[PDB]
Amino acid sequence: PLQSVQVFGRKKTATAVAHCKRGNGLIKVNGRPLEMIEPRTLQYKLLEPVLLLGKERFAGVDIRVRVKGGGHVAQIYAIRQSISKALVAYYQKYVDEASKKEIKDILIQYDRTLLVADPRRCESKKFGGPGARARYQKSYR
Amino acid sequence: TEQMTLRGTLKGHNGWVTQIATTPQFPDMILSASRDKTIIMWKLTRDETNYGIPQRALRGHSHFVSDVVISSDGQFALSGSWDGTLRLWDLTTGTTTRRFVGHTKDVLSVAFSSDNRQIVSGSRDKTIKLWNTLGVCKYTVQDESHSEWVSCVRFSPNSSNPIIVSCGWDKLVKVWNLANCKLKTNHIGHTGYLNTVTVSPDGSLCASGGKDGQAMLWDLNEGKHLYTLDGGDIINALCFSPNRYWLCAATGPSIKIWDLEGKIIVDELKQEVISTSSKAEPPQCTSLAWSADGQTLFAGYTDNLVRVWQVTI
Amino acid sequence: MAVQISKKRKFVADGIFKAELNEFLTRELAEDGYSGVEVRVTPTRTEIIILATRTQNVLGEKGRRIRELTAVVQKRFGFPEGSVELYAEKVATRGLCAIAQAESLRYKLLGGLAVRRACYGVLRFIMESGAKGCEVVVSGKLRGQRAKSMKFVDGLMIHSGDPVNYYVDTAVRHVLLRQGVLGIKVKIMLPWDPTGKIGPKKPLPDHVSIVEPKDEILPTTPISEQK
Amino acid sequence: GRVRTKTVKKAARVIIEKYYTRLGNDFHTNKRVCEEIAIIPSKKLRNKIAGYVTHLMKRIQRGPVRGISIKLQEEERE
Amino acid sequence: NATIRVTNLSEDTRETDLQELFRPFGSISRIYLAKDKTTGQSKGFAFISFHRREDAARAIAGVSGFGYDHLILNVEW
Amino acid sequence: GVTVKDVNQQEFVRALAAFLKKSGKLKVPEWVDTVKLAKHKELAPYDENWFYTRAASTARHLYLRGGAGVGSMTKIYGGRQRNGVMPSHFSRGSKSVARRVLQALEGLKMVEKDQDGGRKLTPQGQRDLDRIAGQVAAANKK
Amino acid sequence: IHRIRITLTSRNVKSLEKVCADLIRGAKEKNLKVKGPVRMPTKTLRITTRKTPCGEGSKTWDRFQMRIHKRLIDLHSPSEIVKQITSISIEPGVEVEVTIADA
RNA sequence: AUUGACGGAAGGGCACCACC
RNA sequence: ACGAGACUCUGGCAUGCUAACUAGUUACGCGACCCCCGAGCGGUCGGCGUCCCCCAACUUCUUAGAGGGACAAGUGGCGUU
Ligand SMILES: [Mg+2]
Ligand SMILES: [Mg+2]
Ligand SMILES: [Mg+2]
Ligand SMILES: [Mg+2]
Ligand SMILES: [Mg+2]
Prior knowledge:
The structure is cut from a larger assembly and holds 7 protein chains of 7 kinds.
Chain B: E1 4-9, E2 17-21, E3 31-34, E4 39-43, E5 53-58, E6 65-70, E7 76-81, E8 86-90, E9 95-100, E10 107-112, E11 118-123, E12 128-132, E13 137-141, E14 150-154, E15 163-168, E16 173-177, E17 182-187, E18 194-199, E19 205-210, E20 214-219, E21 225-230, E22 235-240, E23 246-251, E24 254-259, E25 265-269, E26 287-290, E27 296-300, E28 306-311
Antiparallel strand pairs in B: 1-28, 2-3, 3-4, 4-5, 6-7, 7-8, 8-9, 10-11, 11-12, 12-13, 14-15, 15-16, 16-17, 18-19, 19-20, 20-21, 22-23, 23-24, 24-25, 26-27, 27-28
Chain D: H1 6-19, H2 27-37, E1 38-39, H3 44-60
Chain F: H1 9-22, H2 50-63, H3 70-76, E1 79-83, E2 86-91, H4 95-107, E3 111-113, E4 119-121, H5 123-140
Antiparallel strand pairs in F: 1-2, 3-4
Helix pairs in contact in F: 1-2, 1-5, 2-4, 3-4
The complex binds magnesium ion (5 copies).
Chain A binds 2 RNA strands through strand 1 and strand 2.
Subcellular location (chain B): Cell membrane; Cytoplasm; Cytoplasm, Perinuclear region; Nucleus
GO molecular function, one term (chain B): ion channel inhibitor activity
Main location (chain B): membrane
């Protein structure tokens, strides 16, 4: 009865932890449904795991995500990655490894970032200019 | 007429295959330890598409897994790793129960007793230490131990004189008396580091091999030296055979099977020719395992494969 | 109690106390070979350990000067009376101490001695005291009324990286003279020694040291002893 | 840049000349040997030295490289 | 050979105080106070032989530091 | 069963505002037509019935993350201030609008005073918001 | 019997961790329920100044900083036993603060 | 005859404080 | 030999270790609200509690220590191999 896994997903400073347990096909992010997360321009990014894997692969689990940190777009990329990694880890630990291989191949073939985190972070500003690489305007004469 | 054939491979690894283990209770399941930090429990679906399928992975350690062994009942596995720990896996759940944490440096090999009451390990910190099935380090031998690493430590499945055979990188094979954990016989023959040591199923013989490319047979009743056989390259693993009077060895990229009655090579299993450009060495066989019926040879390799050699008649 | 202060302000205030005490002792015990100070907190007393070369003048005449130093430290920093004891201790090796050698060169210059014989004497003492290398730079009005800088080097001297924070100790001092002020930079490169107080413990980070192999007489024919 | 400096190359060469009998063409076992037998103060230098040791042992097999003197000269009876 | 080199000694220090100081570790054999010639006080050195090489080997780590008479004294073989 | 989280908040706020305006029990201050909702606005709200919408919005903002006060309420409704030729900065909302809104809600028996400090939602406020959420979710699927 | 909390603060990790190790080992030897080292977020105090004493150059800056590390240890034992758990060779850059279940 | 610097000399290399 | 590199700090990884009411998660109990036919191992909760020591465990997220990890290491091609 303890069939549950907690897996995370990070995009820049955002970090979404998806909890996946045995259940009947429910996905909710911060208590809200998956089709009500605010940047509704990028709704298909959130729907991409469920649209690649179908519904029957999700119809035996209860997924509940909790996202914290980062901005809006970084939060939904974290949500994406956490949902995919959570389903992959649940499949690996609780049904079989062939099924994990099949769904991991589908997701990785579509987009690597559903299971591998993007390692880019902001650079440090330096004391010559407004940002990391730019410099203040230099004047002659 | 009794040569072997290549019956298929077992893909699904992401590193060298450092050790393979079987059990007489479940003839449809083998364990393979690797350098992708995971152990794979296989299911032998002997069909045309694939000989085997990865059934369940075990993902405990944080470095390469360097040994693995299945208990007598075929329910609990025991693994050692380069992170310096041992783990006692429960196969049904796929999760670990006990974690042995005494060893400072990388644990090269692990072994089980015949009755699985006490276990032993060996490591790169030049110590051989016993444990029990509960998790506490019982006795760590330090007097007259190996001057270099220990690379293979095994028990001896035989009632009379229960002993612990070991070998390491100081070119020495030491026979330990298990009742008092004292040294009993020291073998000095080898002229290169020893990568493996094995004991015969009938508890009469022992074998040893390594860098020098030669395999030496030592009697375990009187500590003598019967003879010595010569393999082409570095002996990465040795493995006796239960049913037949054969000794198999993984010499470089090929596998030599020495008979032990006429002392001739019955077969020299070679992999097929790939990478036809003569610019790179073939993958080297790293581990050997025999099924309980003795009709199947599982061979680990360096191209992340596990090949299955089936004996014919 | 009523006085409570944030850890940031407390650590900065402790550092400022140590800096001011070290500056005061540097001005007061200059010609006594003062090298450093170490404040040790004990339950009953506060021990200020003064590192000096000539600790008998630091101690004074029958303890008079150390009592005066204790009194001024207590009266300036507001310690409770009798809660601060000043002990003096001799620095182990004087050659591997850039502060002591800079002070020695300073007082050699204060007395009538030429700058070149003084620098060469100090450099020779540092090199004879086990140092891997030393650099003495004296800058000022040395020849006439147009300043220049004379440097004197002997041995190894690293400059860049993190090892220059534990393999090199420097000291800058001034020498007031009739015609101007002279600047004295002394930097010494300590020798490596494991489990010692002479210098650093950890080796230089780009000094690989292969251990010599043991003589390996090989075997001819297998033999085994049944002990 | 990936160009190994003189410290890495010279250390690798001395390690080979003194411990040729314990090195294969395996970066990880070479790394463990070089961390047992040498006193390397860091982990990046250890890895670079073990990498050049592996790359050189993959050349020892295909003829004597200029710069390394070992017992392999004796077996060249010809 | 029970060699003890006490250093950083005081001017007040005489043979008796060193005696009473190393007396809780046992008995002594030979005190040597490196007095100044033609002037009655120490030059900062003391050579002690404790009649046994073991209790002196205990006292070196005992009387180290210790701040005696406002002078931290360094003891050595 | 539907709850406030399981529905589009932007339409739930309009539904709750229409509910509040329907039941004539919300108290409106006399200066509603003459004030900007913060010092960083430029004009007055374009919607005549802005008070009901603001009351509904803060009722929703007290259903989730309850336990708030006028300070946090003016940091919720604060925005960006354009300072002429100087750069822009975040500026908080007006405190009197927030206090009048919370007191009006308290008069409606929906909002009450928290124990530690601040304001939260009575069981009646929970019931009313959940019933309104049920209504908008039902009217979405037709 | 109280809930005694020892807070250790230092500017270097080595001596701080070794004093923590000594305290934990001494407390484990005398059979105490020791809630082990809690590590609070290190405080980085940063001051960025101009390098030059005058006001001429290329406008380069100097970034000094100082880290402060904090550790906690929770003992459940009488006072006189903690009075011998502590007072064993505290390193110089470490500062302890016993809180005996009350301010 | 040598070392430096310079040539409104002659060849190579480098740099978004140079260009494309 | 100095400088470069190495070095130090920092960024990215660890479902492996060490731990945490001055960080949490997950279960369990209580409470509020919604549907309902009678509904529920139902849903929401930054509501409360399990710090009166079990009358709950644990470290995934958070923190920060120790280690590990990357080396042009592996496979092709060029290059005086
Ligand atoms: Mg910018
Ligand atoms: Mg350098
Ligand atoms: Mg550098
Ligand atoms: Mg706002
Ligand atoms: Mg341009």
